[PDB]
């Protein structure tokens, strides 16, 4: 519950920008195109997590996300992700040339439920020819939505997380880049987020949870 909404001074859906968070034992610092935007120092997470990206439509959170109006198909794109480790032999660079089942997995066949109003499908996670991860939010039947979530198989710790992306624009949805660990992985709920609320892509929301 440490939400911070920052003005970008640009529309993030119009092209690629680099977003990042430096996660260290005593702070979290977030950057947009190399520029420091926000610092947090109270109760900073410490459990290593998976790197995740998704796109989804919400329900019951109209005041936060705006109401979703069924517009589809909608796409969020990611050109690369870089993690610079505090430890040697931990760093990696992922260009998104193709699906690498050794390091990533696609969510498929279930819903997160709750505020999430869509089912994850492996078919909505595709790779463009010019190397971009492309997540899609589609519909298979009247008012029935399918969404996409790509996530690392390994867990990562303190260090610099960077991503080049272009979020979707549309009332009711979220395009995100985040680290996560929680009861499903046998640990406490630690997460750090970069979330773009589709209702206004001229702003970005930063958040984190420690033992949520
Ligand atoms: Ca790429």
From Swiss-Prot:
Disulfide bonds join 118-147. Changing residue 191 to D/N/A/L/P/R/H/C/S/Y: Loss of activity. It comes from the Bacteria. The active site is at 191 (nucleophile), 195 (proton donor). Beta-glucanases of Bacillus have a substrate range similar to lichenase of germinating barley. Belongs to the glycosyl hydrolase 16 family. This is Beta-glucanase. It comes from Paenibacillus macerans. The lineage of its organism: Bacteria, Bacillati, Bacillota, Bacilli, Bacillales. The chain holds residues 41 to 149 of 237 of the full protein.
């Amino acid at each position: 519950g440490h939400e911070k909404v920052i003005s970008l001074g640009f529309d993030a859906s119009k092209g690629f920008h680099t977003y990042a968070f430096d996660w260290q034992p005593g702070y979290i610092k977030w950057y947009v195109d190399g520029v420091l935007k926000h610092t947090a120092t109270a109760n900073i997470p410490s459990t290593p997590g998976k790197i995740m990206m998704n796109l989804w439509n919400g329900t019951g959170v109209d005041d936060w996300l705006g109401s979703y109006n069924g517009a589809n198909p909608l796409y969020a794109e990611y050109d690369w992700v870089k993690y610079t480790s505090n430890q040697t032999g931990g760093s990696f660079f992922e260009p998104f040339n193709s699906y690498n089942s050794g390091t990533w997995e696609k969510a498929d066949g279930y819903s997160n439920g709750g505020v999430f109003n869509c089912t994850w499908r492996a078919n909505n996670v595709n790779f463009t020819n010019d190397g971009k991860l492309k997540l899609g939010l589609t519909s298979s039947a009247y008012n029935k939505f399918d969404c996409a979530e790509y996530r690392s198989t390994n867990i990562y710790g303190y260090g610099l997380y960077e991503v080049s992306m272009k979020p979707a624009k549309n009332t009711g949805i979220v395009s995100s880049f985040f680290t996560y660990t929680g009861p499903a992985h046998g640990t406490q709920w630690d997460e750090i987020d970069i979330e773009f609320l589709g209702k206004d892509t001229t702003k970005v929301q930063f958040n984190y949870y420690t033992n949520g």
